[PDB]
Design a protein around this ligand. Sequence first.
Ligand SMILES: [Mn+2]
Ligand SMILES: [Mn+2]
Ligand SMILES: [Mn+2]
Ligand SMILES: [Mn+2]
Lengths: 213, 316, 316, 216
Amino acid sequence: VLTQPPSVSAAPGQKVAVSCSGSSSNIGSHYVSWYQQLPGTAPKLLIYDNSERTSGIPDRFSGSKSGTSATLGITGLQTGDEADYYCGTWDELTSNLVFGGGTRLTVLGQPKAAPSVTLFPPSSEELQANKATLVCLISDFYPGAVTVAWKADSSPVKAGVETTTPSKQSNNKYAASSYLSLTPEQWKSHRSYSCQVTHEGSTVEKTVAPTEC
Amino acid sequence: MVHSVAVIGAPFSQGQKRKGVEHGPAAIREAGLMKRLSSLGCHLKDFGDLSFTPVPKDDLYNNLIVNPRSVGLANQELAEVVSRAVSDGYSCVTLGGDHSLAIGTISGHARHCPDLCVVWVDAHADINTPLTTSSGNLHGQPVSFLLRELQDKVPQLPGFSWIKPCISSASIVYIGLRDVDPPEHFILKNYDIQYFSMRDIDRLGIQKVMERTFDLLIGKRQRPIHLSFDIDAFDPTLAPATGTPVVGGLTYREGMYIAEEIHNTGLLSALDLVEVNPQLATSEEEAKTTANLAVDVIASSFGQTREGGHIVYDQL
Amino acid sequence: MVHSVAVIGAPFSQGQKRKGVEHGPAAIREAGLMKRLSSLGCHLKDFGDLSFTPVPKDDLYNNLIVNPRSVGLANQELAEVVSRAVSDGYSCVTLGGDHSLAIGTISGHARHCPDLCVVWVDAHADINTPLTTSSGNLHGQPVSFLLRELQDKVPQLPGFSWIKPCISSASIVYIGLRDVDPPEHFILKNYDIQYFSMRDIDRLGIQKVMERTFDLLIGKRQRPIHLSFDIDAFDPTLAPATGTPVVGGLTYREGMYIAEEIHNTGLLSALDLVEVNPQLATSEEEAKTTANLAVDVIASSFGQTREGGHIVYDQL
Amino acid sequence: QLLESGGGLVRPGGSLRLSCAASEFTFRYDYHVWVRQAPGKGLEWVSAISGSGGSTYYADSVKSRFTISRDNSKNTLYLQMNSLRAEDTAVYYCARLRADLGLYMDLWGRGTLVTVSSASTKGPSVFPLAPSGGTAALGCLVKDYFPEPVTVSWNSGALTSGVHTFPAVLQSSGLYSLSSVVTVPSSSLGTQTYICNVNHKPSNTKVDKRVEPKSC
Ligand SMILES: [Mn+2]
Ligand SMILES: [Mn+2]
Ligand SMILES: [Mn+2]
Ligand SMILES: [Mn+2]
């Protein structure tokens, strides 16, 4: 019911403002809290009554409300800050607590390693069983954000596509996978298939054919 | 008409940080209140805890943050329950949340006892007017709806048009003040309300205080007595579990003395014990010890003593 | 000349176990001292904390363990800063470390006010001579450099040849003694210095004490008053964060009373608050509560009250 | 601290019961809520209860199926979940609810997982990813296994350097697939054996798979 933009960016030492838009029945009329979702943890309270810090939180954090909107300033950006930030208040039309959808703030203190991509064709075993899977393995990329396009010769494919969300690796770089399901006949009828991976606006595209090795 | 004893729970507050005050009656009930009173040979009648439901929106948020109209209107229901209880010949004990309930219990009493007087034991004077403190202070603001000289400076909040000022400035004595706003300070002075601040107790003594107090209340005629004891009157080391703990307050000894004295007039008609808030305690010990103190006050006011009582003609 | 108020930090000590006493001014500054005073309608002038650097070796070890010459000489710089502050029409508050600063602040005062008298609030008499206690005790030994009858028994330590005894035995009254060495005990007796020990307060009362005190100081003529309040005068439950906590001391009530009384003469010229040592606290709470108490003392001495003050003519 | 539990895999139409064990003795004096987080979506407040359990409030999303309760004697909050769907699949979190100028949640728990998937338990079809930069990457595809996890070794952990196993994809069906991959030098292929041993302990399913289809 509250709108906050989805993502934010900076290098350690800089500063941002996450904005929270709502209405009359909530922000125009009620107080706003700010909660930090450290990845893979339950969220923690940062700010109530629009700007009231909680203990041990540094003054780097600042909140502010004006009529129908609110905003979380964060300065002197640090690693271990990067996480999901949600605004929250009470809406007096529906009689509930509401949150924003969240904003993911990544702190880029590591270099833009584009992804290493390995693409495998369908196995003998699988084709023998009347099935076909193409496997696209994406690794050692930074930051942890990518977008995937499969293409049968020159035509785009979105049907039978399963893509994982990026994950962190041993080295604090990221790894993802994408799977294309075909009939054996679709696999054998096309000259080639290609997984096209785009990272920070730049593409990597690996290609396989039914002709062996 | 103080022949027996009525116990009435009134868990009222405005919410916000001081919302654990609504849990006070249970805490005192859980300090073994009724045993004591029963074992002080009193015929007791337990009238239970009152419904406290906000007006006119009983959704979640209002429960956490209550509006003034909701309190004023829960006091009306209280004055009625106090009134009937007096009418049937009982002494009223009202276990409280915030000191605002005093509005409903004094209004109730006044009704069947219009010559009553008041001893307000408290660190505060709770005598701000609606235009002198914030929306939030209604607990620290209830005496300007009862006093009859303040109505020129007191506006008609909805929920409060039933309140009919049932005390003159010369019928209330304060014991134990140490935290008084300038607005309050001027009122005390300007309308010649007598009071004994922690300074006057350092000087005079709790003995001479009570002496001077009774002379000013019941000195030339017997009246029914309304003890509105606020728990933050006791020094915070004795009573830690409360919303506005102010340092330098009554010792245990001073507080029982006051109770002991009120009982000894045998004129006590109704008693309020308020601002007991267990959410604010450092431990269960602290919550428990505060309510234990609150059970002693009442017990004393109703005949408990530190040197014996009761009946015996012992065997061999 | 006490028309406005000066705040001077003097973080002095001899080191060893009691070296967190140099951190006292910050602790009190951090108890919101200046707010209170500002919000007591006082024109304030914050003269900062003084340099305290050992003489003549400012290497590490001396900082941890300081020599007497270093204190005597930092008091000279203090008397000068006190002197000028009085000369420009201010009441001196000196936030302290150890009670030795009293040497520089009384010497400073005396200088522009030679008819001054002293109220020494303290569990100790701090009146040993250099030959009656250890090198370490200079905090518990400062009154034998000021009194003018002790110079026959007081030797010339380097750093101390500037001190010019500015008080007779009949110008100082002690309140609150409970820990007095035989050397001290004899001196009090032998030179007829009047004092009110915790025993005399149990007997007389803080009310009668202050009555008797003023008669002996300002009874037949008005003089400027120098309150040297030592924090270990308060019973340790109230003031735990201090170097020599002695049990059986002033209640909060007694202590504010003393302050309240000094203010009420409107003669107070300079005030010392000393022996606040946060390193010695069981917690941050204990450190904080000790400094909170110390802010109350000053506040009271400069017009704070437990029953109201200030100005209002309220609206409707 | 707050600590939730008794999450797990429940079949659609299914029931389940959460606990939240609070530490504070002031737990009984304070509203607590339940907020859930659908996997990588935002936060949705689900239910809230009063210090005494005289008042319960529910979200339209979960009303009449879910029932919030507490036992102050046991310092525990409960959530009874009935008629569970895919769309209830979320981490569920207890929290303390308190008031000041407005309302804030100041104390929270670690969470507990509820997965509500139609899919029944099974083992996977394993298929080799043969090889065709001087080094080569070869692997095994672990296809349609329910539920998680699969535990994978190449030459029983003896092959360790250069082994890369991805996080599995949760398919539209509710069935998982993951890819296993090791990087080796091209000289090495013929002389030494390549097997990805695989384990689906749930199904007590173990598959050893040989990777030689380079055909060159
Ligand atoms: Mn009070
Ligand atoms: Mn009160
Ligand atoms: Mn001392
Ligand atoms: Mn001293």
